[PDB]
């Protein structure tokens, strides 16, 4: 399970991090357009 | 880029928020015009 927190907000991000690194996954944050390309390609490191 | 050493090189700027409309700008570590670094700058900021 890979979880992505997108945008700027005041909502709690703890539960999605727990989902990420509980089911052998990873947690990513995408605050703007500039981070989309870098953060949507890093999941191949965990898969390798 | 959260540090002066990271804030180097160039980055993409998306005008009107469109991911397909790109423009290149250099990264520069900027300092606020009104700050609180010393007592004089703090006094100027508080006067403003």
């Amino acid at each position: 399970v890979f979880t992505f927190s997108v945008g700027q907000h005041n909502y709690d991000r703890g539960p999605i991090q727990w989902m990420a690194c509980e089911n052998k996954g990873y947690y990513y944050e995408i605050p703007s357009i500039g981070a989309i390309r870098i953060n949507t390609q890093e999941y191949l490191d965990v898969l390798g | 880029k959260m540090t002066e050493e990271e804030c180097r090189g160039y980055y993409y700027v998306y005008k009107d928020g469109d991911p397909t409309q790109m423009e290149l700008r250099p990264r520069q570590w900027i300092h606020n015009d009104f700050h609180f670094d010393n007592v004089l700058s703090a006094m100027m900021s508080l006067f403003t």
Partner: protein, 96 residues
């Protein structure tokens, strides 16, 4: 930096240099970082194997190392199709 000669070649409709390998770094990735400079330090040993492979089989086309840090070192050296901002156009190429 390095200034190559860039002779004209067949099997490459471009100008290539067989003396070293070219390095492509994504535009938004700052070259000169500790991560990037370290990669360029130890990837300089691939040029000898590039030359050995080319001399063993002269029909080889591009052979490239795609780094996990975004770098791309390919042989033979050749100017990139799209400069950063020399023309009005830019490039969006990440080896990853």
């Amino acid at each position: 930096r390095i200034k190559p000669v860039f002779i004209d070649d067949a099997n490459f409709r471009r100008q290539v240099s067989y003396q070293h390998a070219a390095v492509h770094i994504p535009t938004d990735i700052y070259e000169g970082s500790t991560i990037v400079l370290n990669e360029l330090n130890w990837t300089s040993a691939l040029d000898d194997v590039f030359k050995k492979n080319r001399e063993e089989d002269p029909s080889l086309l591009w052979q490239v190392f795609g780094s996990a840090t975004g770098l791309a070192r390919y042989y033979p050296a050749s100017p990139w199709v799209d400069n950063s901002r020399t023309p009005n156009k830019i490039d969006l190429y990440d080896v990853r």
